[PDB]
């Protein structure tokens, strides 16, 4: 199990093996809504709620579900 960093600035990715520690995403819009995409202060939480935030903390446990840069060559 693993959970990327909180997204301070240099996304390096950290561990998160305390049992309950998914990777949440603090964003306001995401998907081209300014310049640096948008707010996405990642982090690690023990609960994976779900609803219609329209702008709040997302969730996704398992492991390394908050990478962000999943761009493949080509």
């Amino acid at each position: 199990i693993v959970c990327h960093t909180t997204a301070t600035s240099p996304i390096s990715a950290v561990t998160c093996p305390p049992g309950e520690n998914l990777c949440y995403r603090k964003m306001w819009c995401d998907a081209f809504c300014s310049s640096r995409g948008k707010v996405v202060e990642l982090g690690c939480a023990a609960t994976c709620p779900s609803k219609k935030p329209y702008e709040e903390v997302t969730c996704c446990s398992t492991d390394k579900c908050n990478p962000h840069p999943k761009q493949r060559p080509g």
Partner: peptide
């Protein structure tokens, strides 16, 4: 006069997100 360089993060590199 810079007086706010600690707000939040963005998609990856918006050190100063707000503006």
């Amino acid at each position: 006069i810079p007086g706010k360089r600690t707000e939040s993060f963005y998609e990856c590199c918006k050190e100063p997100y707000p503006d």
